[PDB]
Amino acid sequence: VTKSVLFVCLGNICRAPIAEAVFRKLVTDQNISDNWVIDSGAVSDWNVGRSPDPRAVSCLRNHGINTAHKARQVTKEDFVTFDYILCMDESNLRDLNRKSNQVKNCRAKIELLGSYDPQKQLIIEDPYYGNDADFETVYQQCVRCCRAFLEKVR
């Protein structure tokens, strides 16, 4: 059956754009592309409509990955429509758990993307104030976690 994943972070301009692209390439190579609906969302609304941070685009490009990401915000309905909601850090998780209360038929499994990391680096740090190295790290964690996530949910 078709499954759906929603990657969530604070501004949806750095981490989520990277995780979504990484996951998209994984399922495309493995050829299971059409069994998954992939999307991204932000906890906040400041960057709604915005394209990814240029440092996130460069990093992805260094790995032969392209993307036409347009930031949108998470809504109450995402909890009832998506199978999985994978977020970046502690606050994301907290914010999400809190919002999934105003919703009666919540059915999305809200989890930290890093909980799937075999190297157990649970938290995926916001790189907005860092350098290109911090973006490569985020990329490295997403590969680790996404690859592990897929060989576990199908």
Curated annotation (Swiss-Prot):
<protein>
    <recommendedName>
        <fullName>Low molecular weight phosphotyrosine protein phosphatase</fullName>
        <ecNumber>3.1.3.48</ecNumber>
        <ecNumber>3.1.3.2</ecNumber>
    </recommendedName>
</protein>
<dbReference type="InterPro" id="IPR002115">
    <property type="entry name" value="Tyr_Pase_low_mol_wt_mml"/>
</dbReference>
<comment type="subunit">
    <text>Interacts with EPHA2; dephosphorylates EPHA2. Interacts with EPHB1. Interacts with the SH3 domain of SPTAN1.</text>
</comment>
<keyword id="KW-0007">Acetylation</keyword>
<dbReference type="GO" id="GO:0004726">
    <property type="term" value="F:non-membrane spanning protein tyrosine phosphatase activity"/>
</dbReference>
<keyword id="KW-0963">Cytoplasm</keyword>
<keyword id="KW-0904">Protein phosphatase</keyword>
<dbReference type="GO" id="GO:0004725">
    <property type="term" value="F:protein tyrosine phosphatase activity"/>
</dbReference>
<dbReference type="GO" id="GO:0005737">
    <property type="term" value="C:cytoplasm"/>
</dbReference>
<dbReference type="GO" id="GO:0003993">
    <property type="term" value="F:acid phosphatase activity"/>
</dbReference>
<feature type="active site" description="Proton donor">
    <location>
        <position position="126"/>
    </location>
</feature>
<feature type="active site" description="Nucleophile">
    <location>
        <position position="9"/>
    </location>
</feature>
<keyword id="KW-0378">Hydrolase</keyword>
<comment type="similarity">
    <text>Belongs to the low molecular weight phosphotyrosine protein phosphatase family.</text>
</comment>
<feature type="active site">
    <location>
        <position position="15"/>
    </location>
</feature>
<dbReference type="InterPro" id="IPR036196">
    <property type="entry name" value="Ptyr_pPase_sf"/>
</dbReference>
<feature type="modified residue" description="Phosphotyrosine">
    <location>
        <position position="128"/>
    </location>
</feature>
<comment type="function">
    <text>Acts on tyrosine phosphorylated proteins, low-MW aryl phosphates and natural and synthetic acyl phosphates.</text>
</comment>
<dbReference type="InterPro" id="IPR017867">
    <property type="entry name" value="Tyr_phospatase_low_mol_wt"/>
</dbReference>
<feature type="modified residue" description="Phosphotyrosine">
    <location>
        <position position="129"/>
    </location>
</feature>
<dbReference type="Pfam" id="PF01451">
    <property type="entry name" value="LMWPc"/>
</dbReference>
<dbReference type="InterPro" id="IPR023485">
    <property type="entry name" value="Ptyr_pPase"/>
</dbReference>
<dbReference type="InterPro" id="IPR050438">
    <property type="entry name" value="LMW_PTPase"/>
</dbReference>
<keyword id="KW-0597">Phosphoprotein</keyword>
